[PDB]
């Protein structure tokens, strides 16, 4: 079966149509070639034969002086935006500016929504983890943090690609003039308006990038603080264990003393209770003294 | 209700007025459009129809050849600066230079105050943490350090944005000439003065950025030193525990020896005390010798 | 023996030949010199006397207006690509574009295959390692991860070299015109087509680089999470050991008490069982109470 | 009281004078304004009205075609350089070159001295710390290392500022011509000589920066090695403790066996010594065997 | 004594001479000044009065249209290269190209030898360290790794300096024309040949830099894997110790039980062996059950 695009077409007045068209007929209707409508790049803004070709992660658009076309919109939850919002936006400047503004605004709003969803989860998870009142931390929250960090990295990459794509155009004047397809098709400055639009969207993307970078550095700092807290708790517990170990060592030493003094043999000392009481008292007082001395030895270190 | 701006207006002589004006009337009074007075960017310096539009994190200003306007100043603690200091500053160069210098000086002073407040707290907290006389560190100080580091990152971002915004203007001569609104409105070089002003403020921002970077690297080094100190204390405590464990092992071994020699059974040796004394002495001397040998074995490792 | 190249030659129609030719004869047949056909660089695209010289890690190609030559193809598993696919590709634009597109597509497909093989292994290994249900992790998987990370770094380097080599050409127009060897040999714009080709391949390489960078940052985050999980498990185990140590300390203390009360000597208290029962009960209840008190002391910390 | 500068003035012949002059009189004597002699920047090289204004961290200089002035030299240990070395240096090229060379050489020598003092201390401290013959490290040396690293970061920042300040001038020819104040005051190429001077000093600064960077990376590597050594020692000590713990466990198990066999009750076995000897031998041999088996179990892991 | 250079001179035909000459006579013989033959920079390529001045870490060369001079070659192991290889290389292009190619090839070969020596040692050391079959790692190998990493950093710095020095020349055409001293001394394109030479050597240096960077990242990854392995072994050993501690706790608890039941007092139960056997069996079975329960409690965690 011949390959076919699923196109939805918007007119200047905002009227909407939708159909399925074979690629060869689409090329013939326009002045393009299969070399152009390939969409091999995730992000791209290009001009060919006075036709603008724009692509996002999952959005594909062709802009003409008299119409707009969105391609392969099925199973992407774009119906609400396509049939409810876009016609209102498209209804003194030419059509190209309206269409480009609509698409760029859609992408920017999508990125802003992603960031707004990501931020509170990460902040709350980090706040919960950093609580120094616990000697251990949950691991489900760690898994959540890892997944959200992956999503944040993807968002940063998308923002950087958007910025680079727009900047590549803003620098050269030739592309700025090319985007003014209506002027060239049928021979106030349009280049200035295009520059303003692209500058605005580039600045918004820069702000988003700065926010994401701040979030990432916050994550790193929280991780370091977590490490430090865990190490401190380890040291405290080891100190406690060491103190108890010294106590047990003294107790066992004088337990051996008593066991030796209490063998099932002849000692020639079983007829006196004074010696027994003296031995018990000596054991106890000496255990106290040696424990205190070992505590002091630990303290001096 | 129609949207309205809360404006405070400064004349050339420094006279001050304040009122509330609807946006449409404000656009009509000037030569601007709603596309300009939107303030969608956190930091922006722009020129439109010989009117300068400046924005900061929370400051919004419009500069004309004959007046200055500050918008949305409510609930921002700007009364002291607005009604006490600015009129004195504004009272041979045209008005634009005075206004721009005032605004930039205000922002720079704000950033300097933030940095001056942040520095001593971080320095003292790090000095307290790094003290090697403790095996553990407080965690409230760690939380304070984390919050102050977040604030420091925000400050660094603000400084970088300021530097980039000014540099974008300093490079191009067209914008430098545009900022000289008085010259164009009613046809010594003004561009040189503007270049001097922007260069001065850019250099001050660069100095602040360098200071912040130095503080951050200091924080990182302190964290590494903290880790090392904690690990060393851990190793010392483990060495102590190991020594005591070897002692206890020897004591328990010869305690088992004595217990076996002292069962409630027949041994055919209960009639001699010499054997008992010899056993006790052997136990004690052997415990000493084996403890010393184990200490040597630990030492060789 | 004189050095010799093993060449396979493709004509315009796609006909294929293969032979071995001495370097001097090859230089004489073309207009080149030994200074050119040296291949001292891993990645290089150059033009000399209207002949294109291209090199990859292990691929060496010479492009002329009428023929293509691949050199040193032995023992490299290139037979399938050389004798089955390339002739079909080479069979209105001149030959140079077809040849360059074929070579660049081959290299890009190779890199994509490498990345596609690497990704799932790393993802699955990291997912297995991060599982917080274990207190330890396998080390064979760690070795696998290390080797795959080394391969990923090599891939990133190759992609960066490819991007730099293409970009060095895209910027200058002189090289773009030079690559159009057919135009100069025998005096629609060819430079535009070359720019389109190189831009497409550069963008594909950029996408691959972004993917690799994302994978690397994911690896780093997973490593940090692994460290945190291990530390938490350590702390939990130490807490358990500390609790048991306090219990054992109490038990040994009152064991010493009982041993002292049960020496093989005279105590003047052996005729009463009430004292014995009271001592046993006191030991048990006191052990419980002291264990609870030590647990509370640990809790307060 | 009116603000006053403390100036020391050098003539062309090297004669030296020193006095205190009010700022207004200084401005009047030269052709400058208070906007220039403010010294709000830590590092700055500027030209105003054929007068060169130079600043360092604590050095302030004004250069004219016929004289040099150093401002605010009190309490800075500059007497030796001011009254002993500089006159000799200043005694065919004009005065500006000599003065600038002297100041830049002074700054470069200061930075070189700082680096030469810092290097050996850090190297020796790291060599002492890295010694793998100890399970712990001193902390006073760590504090010293931290302070010296802070000083190194400050030095790196100073070098970077110096390089940037000189480079900003080297690129533009206009500033190079401006620095030739003598040519313009009273109308072989001077710009070439200035370029040579600035290039020489920039290259020296670059060398210093490279040295500092190498030192910093060395510090980082030493820190990592320290961490690894501490962890290895921890593992060794834990292995020793585990072995001793298994031994103690076996000893205590068979101690319980013997204690149970030696209660103060009736066992119907007290009339035979063969059973007693067999029990003792069984306990000892079994303890040896179980200890060996546990050692093997540890080994297999 | 007057300062003197130790020079070795090569003629066009390759004839070699060597002598010692005072600096003033050397300046007079050429057209240079002491400002040039100072060699204050580690790496430098310069042109003065149609004389090329080149410096490396320890190599100093002066190139003229008719001769080459190497200065200060004593005690540097350059005799083999100076008196055996260089004359052969120097024996249609002018002399400058041959001399520059020889010097650059020498430096590149030196760097390649350094890298080839460094690589296998680091690879083998890392392979030995990463072996997960040991709970500890040797420290002599760590010291070796540290020293080799320092050497690698020095090599990277040298390569970067070489690349920067060559690139500074490649960009400007004026320096490329200046290097063609023979053309200017006594009035096919030489600039093209110089560009080819410098491009070749720059590309080789870039390849070396990439290799060094790959080695460094490999080192870092190996360090991280080492940390992870050590932590895992720590956790395993702690688990073993915890299990043995729980066993010992149960044993000591029921040892206290038996000791209490076996005091040297009156219990009114010494006439029955059934109670004794029941107590022993209860102790043993309960110890088994409590040990199993504690193992389950550890497992659930």
From Swiss-Prot, chains A, B, C, D, E:
Domain of life, source organism: Eukaryota
Subcellular location: Mitochondrion inner membrane
Binding site for Mg(2+) 3: 262, 264
Transmembrane annotation, as ranges: 242-261, 273-301
Paired cysteines (S-S): none
Keywords, ordered alphabetically: Ion transport, Magnesium, Membrane, Metal-binding, Mitochondrion, Mitochondrion inner membrane, Transit peptide, Transmembrane, Transmembrane helix, Transport
UniProt-annotated binding residues for Mg(2+) 2: 231
Function per UniProt: Magnesium transporter that mediates the influx of magnesium into the mitochondrial matrix and regulates magnesium metabolism. Also permeable to calcium, sodium and potassium ions. Required for normal expression of the mitochondrial respiratory complex I subunits. May play a role in maintaining the inner mitochondrial membrane potential.
Record comment regarding domains: The GMN motif acts as an ion selectivity filter.
Protein name: Magnesium transporter MRS2 homolog, mitochondrial
Native source organism of the sequence: Homo sapiens
Gene coding for it: MRS2
